[PDB]
Symmetry: C2
Subunit: 156 residues, 2 copies
């Protein structure tokens, strides 16, 4: 890509917007679309796996959604400083077997002047849940404007 | 009636200090000592496990170090805002079957006015490593001031 606003340094509002746009992107479960938000030579650590460029990042995303079905995500701001944002998130999905999980994650982002993400450090843990325990409800895609956020679902 | 500085809101400097003190605490592998840094009604989610008070947190730590042998930790600041700190970290250890691991974590902290942590959200992933891949070698306990941090060690992968 070339430029994707908001651009750093972030303010509380622009950081929250940056996060919402990212959330919408991942809720599309489209590797190509999602990959465009990252630098060509983006550096990633997703769990115990690493990516060293946008192409490897996209490859990971393709594997990801071939595994995590009916994926629904919610991201929320934790803290931000200059060109860095710390985000908390959770997503619900079911595997090929049909069993459900809620994944809890913390991702730390760093953006270049063009608004593209140069570094992504994400740690995620999967917790099995019963189908009736799903908390995220909305048509696959962008989370509706009025759907409660991460801290409003009593996840803690 | 505890008071544990640095106190919020944090500055870059005090946030780094807060993190270093926490790292020293966990590197003691002492459940009681570490538990005192959290509020009596502290709320935690560590991986897929939850704790709802200091006692439950302490019980978790007791299980943790009975399992994660020869544990060595390094924490580093990512970002901070008001009474919240976002931390990146890694710890090396081995299980009692001889398997070594390097665990990568991202933990987000929220402190009360007295510097005690009221909320802890930690996500951690484990990468199996060979003993020869170990990067942390200091005597069990506090990391020497002369020892490189996460940034000085650089990206840690096979």
């Amino acid at each position: 890509a070339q430029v994707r606003p908001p651009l750093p340094p972030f303010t509380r509002e622009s950081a929250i917007e940056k996060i919402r746009l990212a959330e919408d992107g991942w809720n599309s479960r489209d590797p190509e679309r999602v990959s465009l938000a990252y630098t060509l030579d983006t550096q990633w650590r997703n769990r115990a796996e690493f990516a060293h460029n946008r192409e490897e990042a996209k490859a990971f995303l393709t594997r990801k959604w071939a595994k995590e079905l009916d994926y629904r995500l919610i991201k929320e701001l934790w803290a931000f400083t200059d060109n860095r944002i710390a985000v908390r998130y959770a997503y619900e999905w079911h595997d090929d077997s049909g069993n459900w999980f809620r994944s809890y994650g913390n991702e730390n982002w760093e953006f270049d002047e063009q608004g593209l993400m140069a570094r992504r450090f994400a740690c995620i843990n999967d917790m099995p849940i019963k189908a009736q325990e799903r908390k995220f409800h909305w048509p696959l895609g962008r989370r509706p404007d009025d759907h409660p956020g991460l801290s409003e679902l009593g996840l803690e």
